[model samples]
Target: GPVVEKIAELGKYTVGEGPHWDHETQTLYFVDTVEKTFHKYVPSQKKYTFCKVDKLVSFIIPLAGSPGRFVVSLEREIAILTWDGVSAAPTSIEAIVNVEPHIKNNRLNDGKADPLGNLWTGTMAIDAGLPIGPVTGSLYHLGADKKVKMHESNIAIANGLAWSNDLKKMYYIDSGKRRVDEYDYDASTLSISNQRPLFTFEKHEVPGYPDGQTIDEEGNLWVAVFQGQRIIKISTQQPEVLLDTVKIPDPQVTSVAFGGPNLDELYVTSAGLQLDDSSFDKSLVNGHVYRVTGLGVKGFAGVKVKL
Candidate 1:
């Protein structure tokens, strides 16, 4: 069992998600989609610094071999942001591509780097703008050659991504389906096929939809159950059984990452979206970041995507 504690709280993050840790820098990075802001936290200094953005900044991952630079995904574009020399504020942020120019109704959602350090991200339809709602989303891969390639389509919500320790399997979540799917990953060809259901949940099973996810060293998946107030750990070996669950006071847990000195800390991000101020005020952990210690498990160091 692990104990959960409130670490960082922000009253204004309408949809605070995407938590990633850089072990080398001892820092944690996250996003507030509704607020259009990016945040960086350094545990060593007990600090919190953020930069406001113009559009929805869904996620950010460090650029491989490029310190202080990152690849960030905005709802409609992807950009490379360079911090002005160790400063928290971005010196230059340039949008490199409009990934879904053909699909005006969709925007980028969750993303991560593959074991080979290639970037993979996807988009979900803006049902709020469409009368039908829940339009099909598609997944894209950013190759080392600097091209965005579409790989899968008909995704309700392209979210959560991770690969096995040996890089033989890829685990992903469509979140909209209440299920996680596994795919056969070919490193050399950089393709995913033969998708199979890894785990699925029935209606009202965990409270919230699944969101961001990460993989542990032993190849287990730690997924944040948005609006569920908890993170569940599942493994391919057990397929259908939840190996463990860590509860938080926050009702919307969006993502989880392993950090701390030895990558033993499990940090979680929550959301303030589905509720009014008064509603969240009544809860102790709404729109906040949380951490769990003494989990007795370690995760791989932070991964990187090519610039």
Candidate 2:
């Protein structure tokens, strides 16, 4: 189900990687991690605003009970961020947890809230310049009690995370290996085990290097394909077949989400940097957020971040 045009009014994000909805504020928040810019898009008023931060921010989500605040996955740690109207042009930053202050090679990528009220995100080795770096990524589960638990290690790029409808399984995408893995999940203990490979795709495949993902009411996976310029919607169950793909203008598509009053709109984001002459084309917008409609599907609300 690829489309040619975008629906959202804003464009030009230098790596917009996370898309989240806050029902209380009626805003869609995502981050341009590389540029250290956070965005707030209000559909009701057709307005948007930007907040600049000091560190590299991969993604951020609104806290369940916390308003006018964000749990930002900064380059160093998960920080509690809020712009004090009392201050002069700076968001007050507090630490929820430090990911790896001593390690300089890694940065947090994708963090999402689960239905059970927890934030799950992971880190990856910095893949700057040409060749890839060593694999040091690890997945972390930050529960409501402010406890940080590691579920998986030895990963290069810990991206694309989603929980099943019944909360019995967790689906994750490791972009480095070009693979999707599923794990048996226990919401009670906040444990994940019995890891198994759900699907695989080689480099340059139709859907190249899955980035961030969102699950629909029907359990279909809407995955953003990095370097592939498309969003692949597929069945989450078994053979994991590709159901549909929405073509995008930018080659470095980064993340996807479902929002709107009806929760039926598909919102997408793409990167504007790190492209060669062939893929760049000079005609593309680079960083942009798009809204796709007419999919005949609805999605769950933004998961609540308990802490």
Candidate 3:
């Protein structure tokens, strides 16, 4: 495969973390986490627009039947918003789970809908202005009925998530531990089990942690290595290096998603929130949205609400 190419510069934000694609509008929806804002990028118009919210905005997913309806995870709850692929306004906001009352340091992180249309998101703890712990976190699922269920627990940082092409298996990154885990999934029941380690870091000392990830059509995992200034492509079955790295200007590559008509466009989000003044100055591309063209398989569209 050819090297990842920078197709476009989508400007800067406070901390652009989640980069998701809306197939219906052919626009990319992502978040400026610390700023509590959601953004949409229209390639056709070559323009970007944003919506400001009250709390830290983590992720956004468009609903299935409801054309403009979308779901978002705020600091302490899952919120519903009405967006027209450019601008947005909040419709409804409710608590899916209140980790605040228990672990005050934790906040919701990366998330995506499963093949069955269930929203799966994770939470992590922050301590002393830094993320540390026994590293407790959990995976949560929000169903169509508005019911929230805690699916798994005792994790460090539940980062990237994806399902196999057949939807029979699930891949997740426990980032704080630097390992990717897989599970046998039951789409009909929305259940998962048989947890096992799929990959581990050996050669390099990654600066921060593994952040977001996507799986190619051939079942290869493409992960954004935070603090490593690159994305690594790993084979699903073996320890071989598919692609050692996709270099970017920012060291903290928080997340990645495939977009564009052909799905070969790889969209990446980087962070500058944790860097010191000097470090931040050195990283001019720190909190911007970048596109890597001519990459892997096309990605699935963002699931929208039926109603």
lDDT of 2 by residue, 96-133 (tens): 88877777978898889878878999988766322255
* Candidate 3, residue 15: lDDT: 73
Candidate 2 lDDT at 75 equals 89
- The candidate with the higher TM-score, 1 or 3, is 1
* Model 3 residue pairs with clashes: 62-303, 62-304, 63-304, 63-305, 64-304, 64-305, 65-305
Per-model tally of clashing residue pairs: 0, 2, 7
Using Cα atoms with residue i matched to residue i, what is each candidate's TM-score against the true structure?
0.91, 0.92, 0.87
Q: Can you tell me which runs of candidate 1 are displaced by over 4 Å?
A: 8-12, 85-89, 128-132, 275-285
Clash pairs for candidate 1: none
Q: Sort by TM-score, best first: what order?
A: 2, 1, 3
Q: Which parts of model 3 have CA positions greater than 4 angstroms off?
A: 1-9, 84-103, 128-131, 203-208, 239-242, 276-281, 305-307
| C-alpha RMSD values across all candidates | 2.9, 2.5, 3.0
What is the C-alpha local distance difference test score of candidate 1? 0.79
Q: What is candidate 1's TM-score against the reference?
A: 0.91
RMSD of 2: 2.5
Total clashes in model 3, counting residue pairs 3 or more apart in sequence or in different chains: 7
Per-residue lDDT value at 204 in model 2: 25
